[PDB]
Amino acid sequence: MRGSHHHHHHGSIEGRMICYNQQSSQPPTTKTCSETSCYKKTWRDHRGTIIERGCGCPKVKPGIKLHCCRTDKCNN
Incomplete structure (x- = not known):
């Protein structure tokens, strides 16, 4: 429950999706x-x-726990 992201109505230019990179x-x-x-x-x-x-x-390299989703914050 509440696993899906928030998204809204659109009508402006298709700029690139914003990922993030926190550490x-x-x-x-x-x-x-x-x-x-x-x-x-x-x-x-x-x-x-x-x-x-x-x-x-x-x-x-082996023993690293990798996971990777298609766009933006979709991995989080």
């Missing part, structure tokens, strides 16, 4: 992207357990 030291931070997906992933590294997201979904 375990950096605020909820936005940008325009048109990669094949926007994503979420997490692993253990020199800094400890670090938290990651950005635009794009290339192959990763």
